[PDB]
Design a protein around this nucleic acid. Sequence first.
RNA 1: UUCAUCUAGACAGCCGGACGGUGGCCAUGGAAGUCGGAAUCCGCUAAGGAGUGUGUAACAACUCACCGGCCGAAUGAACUA
Lengths: 129, 254, 52, 158, 129, 197, 191
Amino acid sequence: YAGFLLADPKIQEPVFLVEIQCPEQAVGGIYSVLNKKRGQVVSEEQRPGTPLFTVKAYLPVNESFGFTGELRQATGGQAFPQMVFDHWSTLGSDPLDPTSKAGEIVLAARKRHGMKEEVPGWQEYYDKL
Amino acid sequence: KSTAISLYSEMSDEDVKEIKQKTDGNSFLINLIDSPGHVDFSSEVTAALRVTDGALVVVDTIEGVCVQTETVLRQALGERIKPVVVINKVDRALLELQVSKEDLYQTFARTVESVNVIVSTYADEVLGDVQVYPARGTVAFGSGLHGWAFTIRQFATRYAKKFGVDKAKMMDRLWGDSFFNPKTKKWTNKDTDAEGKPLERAFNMFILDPIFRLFTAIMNFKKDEIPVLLEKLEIVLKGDEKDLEGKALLKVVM
Amino acid sequence: IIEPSLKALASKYNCDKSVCRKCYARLPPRATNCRKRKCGHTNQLRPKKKLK
Amino acid sequence: NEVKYLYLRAVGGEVGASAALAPKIGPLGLSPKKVGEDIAKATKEFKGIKVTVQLKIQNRQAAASVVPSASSLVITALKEPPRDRKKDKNVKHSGNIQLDEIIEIARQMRDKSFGRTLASVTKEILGTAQSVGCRVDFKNPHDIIEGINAGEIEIPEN
Amino acid sequence: TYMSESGEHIVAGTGELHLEICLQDLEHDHAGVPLKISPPVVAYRETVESESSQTALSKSPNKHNRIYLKAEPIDEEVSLAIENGIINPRDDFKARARIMADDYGWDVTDARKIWCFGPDGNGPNLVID
Amino acid sequence: IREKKAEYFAKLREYLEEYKSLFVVGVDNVSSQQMHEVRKELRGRAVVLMGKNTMVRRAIRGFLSDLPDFEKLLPFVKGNVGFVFTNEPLTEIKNVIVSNRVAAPARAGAVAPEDIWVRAVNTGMEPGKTSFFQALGVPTKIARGTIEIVSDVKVVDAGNKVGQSEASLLNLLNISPFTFGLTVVQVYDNGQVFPSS
Amino acid sequence: MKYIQTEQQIEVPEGVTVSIKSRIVKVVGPRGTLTKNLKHIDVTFTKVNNQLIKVAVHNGGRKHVAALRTVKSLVDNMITGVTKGYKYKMRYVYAHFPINVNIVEKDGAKFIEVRNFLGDKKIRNVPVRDGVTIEFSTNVKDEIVLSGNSVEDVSQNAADLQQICRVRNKDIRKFLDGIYVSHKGFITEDL
RNA sequence: UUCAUCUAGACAGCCGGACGGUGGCCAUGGAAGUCGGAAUCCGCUAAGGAGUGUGUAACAACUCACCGGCCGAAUGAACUA
Ligand SMILES: [Zn+2]
């Protein structure tokens, strides 16, 4: 418990791999949409004979609620998603600082877990000697 | 829900002899499932799509070929399903836009050319000829709400009973560059300016003309025009349904 | 729908306008100064946002 | 017979992906792998450096041909190790390629140039090289134009 | 429909309204009893993103024993190997360490002194003596 | 400012005293690349330089003492005219300038010169552009995965300007109702001017 | 500033005769006679040769002298307004519902009818001022013809149908429907 | 008040060109004038920025500086109270 809290603790969140069968005009929203929900473009492709793309992307599960509808709302219903979890990404922001970017979900995790308000720092769990 | 419904239709020799199908008998039995078209019910239809070989893709003329229309139509073509295309809500197009003779003809062309692009873009290379053609009789026009529609092949026969006209090639004559050329009685293939007063098409001249004239009687509630044309129109009425006004007289007559 | 030429014709009157920071009126020809006295004929203009 | 014509920015000597060809060449009924194979063959010795790839289709034959590019060809000559995307961002380029090397390419360029004199073509082609910012013969590329204007780099217009 | 890793029945559906009407059956048509709805919580993972700048110390309740440890960010490839069976807990020492030392660069000696895998004996958390 | 125009005055003087004969090039509707290809071809043969009509008109006034011949051609110097000095056979120079043409595309706004036709031709075009074809209201049909026109139609009349949509359709089929190139109105030769024709 | 003398010229073509009182301007031509009252302007008219009229203001300021050219535009528009006329072509703009236009009479006022605009059931009746003509002209779909001698009269009414048909509490950038001025020219073609 | 442009045609106005090298170096999945870091080069030049905006995901298709056709005498910009 002590040793974890001295080595720059971080939290890692699961990442979907999402691939989209979308036509040409509506793909532009995805690049706009993803950077508003931290989505990451992996690769673009088009099926031979049809004009629709097939574009693969990484979206953290965090920003993945209601995502298709706004994708449906942004694309006029023309884009169609296929959704699957791929891997985990590490949060760049500190999850120890209560006012940090990762420090709100963990505080919410404290809210849903019943734990204290303060997060255990490395000062506790460690007998200084 | 997607439940099959039973539908039974007898028919006479002239229309069963004119059937290019591997089959035998005089009876046809139609089993139809009404899947809901909501795109978020895309799984109730994908099971529903598989169970059949023909699919009735209903398309609205006002909104045109919409986004979800394309999607399920591509889904049907994924299974190699032969489609029949029916456009509803002509009454909407004939009462909201009031497109008189050519715009209605042109708008139909817009959609059918649009859908023909889709079937030519998504025809699998085992059938090839899944293309839809109003000339081939796979496209109808009518009002689902009011419960009336027509087919060119059904309409193609109605004329030789009074003109003695050929049937084989007039079914594909109703579309494209071919013009009835009234005042001359010749199915010309170009306007040619008619030496002045450029001449009309057979489609506009023959089929839509009675339709729009009846509306003028009906949609303005013109009591003086109903009885004369209906007798020319070889239809019958009932003892009491004659006494119905516009937007409801139209329903029963067609 | 509207044919593109007619759409441009109408938008020249409906969208191709400017706005004063202070008085919000839709009255440029191409103006550099507002015509209203409530804004004091101020020169602070923006082009009216074009849809999408 | 349709002579279909296209360009690329595929990097030399590194197999060009069909993923930038399948959108374009895929529609025109072509096996991507074999037509792509032609691209790699046309780009063999150009290893490391992007260059545009002329491609002439004479009835479904991918005759790709690297357009010899002033920027690209000079950078090949610098001897700097072929840049891999991963390796480093915006690697600068400083090969000491001689001015005499340039005039050979200028003779490769006058057909695609407009200068009255062959020296004027050198002004142009170095002007493209001037964009790149690489060093040439331990001197400012711009002064070569001025030096040429000063009658110093006399070009054998033949 | 299925259960999350934290013991909450996580129903899945096509779109936002589809959940409404399908659930609308539950209280009224399908099940017939009123229940509540909440967004499913995303299960995070905790890790380090540094190399344990300061050495961890802890004292036993009797203070006779002391433990000195280090924390290090095991890389994703080892994590990928662990979860995909490349590094098998059931395998024995002098064989399990060979592949990951050979194909992941680890040191011969340290990889031999693996005490256990955690949690559950096959997780991605590791102890090195 | 003044120096360059005097420099231009000097530049005209030099050509005025280096080429006995010249062409009066009509520069109506000349694009920029078309100029580049022309000056590529005339290399060695001719020189091309045009400029301000007033500067050209003013410069000769200071040159008229040495060059009083150019008086006769001035009332032919009207509008878009330039100067092409050369000492090469009459027939050859005229044809090559007026032979090399460019099938100039139709940009939206340009007046339709004459009635444009669309013919029942096989487009050989990928179907995706059918929407573009539909936009102009062209009856179309898909055979061999390309659009094919059903009927010949006079799209627009002679006169009325080509709209944006029409310009889009013409550009797609490489149809271009515009032929653009360098013209020549007059010819000055050893102090004897006559129309080019 | 106060220019001592500033004037503009007003060409009189062959078919125009101008009767000018103190401020009562009367232009007489082939198609009729136009009259306007300018008692608000304080200008000075002078006939030079029956074919040029010089209008000058003495000791006029920037505010004062600017309106003089306004008068010349006013008189010139009268001159061309009685000779070439002023014609306004009006185009119907509609996305789904075509705007239904009629000509109707109420107490003998030549009311122009707008029905079914945006599907609305109300009747727009706009009186036609004297001298302005309404024509529905073929060969351009859904366009009416607004013609009359005086530019002020035609454009005020040509505009007024535009304002009654503006969309409320809606994004006008998407609802382009309306009846919009298409051309402002002269009744005589190329003249 | 200052600084300018100006019959060797000032400004406004209607029209044309607004190239090629050139998808300038590189990046981002892709970037081609325009998410950006970078150089502000050369030829033809009547003149054109490795680009002022519309613009696509990129393309592309438009467009402006820049300069030229038509008219003719003044005009521009920044500051003062
Ligand atoms: Zn204001």
